[PDB]
Amino acid sequence: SPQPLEQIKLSESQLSGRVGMIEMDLASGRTLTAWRADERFPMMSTFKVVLCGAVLARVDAGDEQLERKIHYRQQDLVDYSPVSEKHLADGMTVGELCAAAITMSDNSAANLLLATVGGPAGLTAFLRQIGDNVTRLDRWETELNEALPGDARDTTTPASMAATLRKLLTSQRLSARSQRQLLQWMVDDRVAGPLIRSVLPAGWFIADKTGASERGARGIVALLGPNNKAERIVVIYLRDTPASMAERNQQIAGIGAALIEHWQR
Numbered sequence: 001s002p003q004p005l006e007q008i009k010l011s012e013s014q015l016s017g018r019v020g021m022i023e024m025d026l027a028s029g030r031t032l033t034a035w036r037a038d039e040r041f042p043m044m045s046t047f048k049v050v051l052c053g054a055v056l057a058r059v060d061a062g063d064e065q066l067e068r069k070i071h072y073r074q075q076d077l078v079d080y081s082p083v084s085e086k087h088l089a090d091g092m093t094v095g096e097l098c099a100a101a102i103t104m105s106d107n108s109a110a111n112l113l114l115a116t117v118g119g120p121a122g123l124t125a126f127l128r129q130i131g132d133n134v135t136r137l138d139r140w141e142t143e144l145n146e147a148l149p150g151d152a153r154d155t156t157t158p159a160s161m162a163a164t165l166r167k168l169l170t171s172q173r174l175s176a177r178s179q180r181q182l183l184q185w186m187v188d189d190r191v192a193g194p195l196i197r198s199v200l201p202a203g204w205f206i207a208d209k210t211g212a213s214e215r216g217a218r219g220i221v222a223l224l225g226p227n228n229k230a231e232r233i234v235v236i237y238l239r240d241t242p243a244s245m246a247e248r249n250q251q252i253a254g255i256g257a258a259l260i261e262h263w264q265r
């Protein structure tokens, strides 16, 4: 593989789309690689990590409990509810809802949790309160995945998302237990985590949340590193490509390959 920046450029040429990426040390925030890091990209399901950070902040303040059971109705469900459609009789706890949102990308779980933090506007306010002045959530699932060209709704930048993830995971804004919970939910991703491990060399840590839109977008927020350590945050977003989902996936994987082969920068 080529050097990471060279591979990112090649991916734009092959996809005819825009790529945005940051690679950052998790412990310190050192930025190693920036490419279109201040340009906007749709978050898609990657927003669910920030959502559950806001839920955990409420738990830490005594305004929520991960144990609290939410009884919801079938009319509350939106498209793609693999976990939440199974619990119309018995409900789900707040913590189960976050696990479903992050680890299964369950959309109805995410909307139930979004309500608890004051909707898109409440989540955006939380972001402002932790010093992210760029990321914005405007819509609910599934409309937030529309990814219309030129639309600023439901977007982040690679730089803002990486900094926000680092804040949630490490800055002691969340309690120790809450930081550990957020990390574990990402470690437990079932959508892409197992597939990524099956193509990662031995020794590499992964934790992640992915997102997708049928209108030529794709993204991942990840923790990655050798020696089984979550050394770096890697954020990659794609937009405005006509390419197949498979080719979007392959190009993101190719950027990862370039990082792995050229890690010590």
Ligand SMILES: OC[C@H]1O[C@H](O[C@H]2[C@H](O)[C@@H](O)[C@H](OCCCCCCC3CCCCC3)O[C@@H]2CO)[C@H](O)[C@@H](O)[C@@H]1O
Residues within 6 Å of the ligand: 001, 196, 199, 200, 201, 220, 222, 223, 224, 234, 236, 252, 253, 254, 255, 256, 257, 258, 260, 261
């Ligand atoms: O010399 C480095 C390594 O080179 C290859 O590893 C390949 C691997 O066989 C392939 O499957 C992967 O694809 C990359 C898969 C990307 C995984 C995650 C991508 C995401 C998630 C994390 C952030 C970035 C994007 O590339 C590496 C590096 O070439 C060898 O197989 C391996 O023995 C060797 O240790």
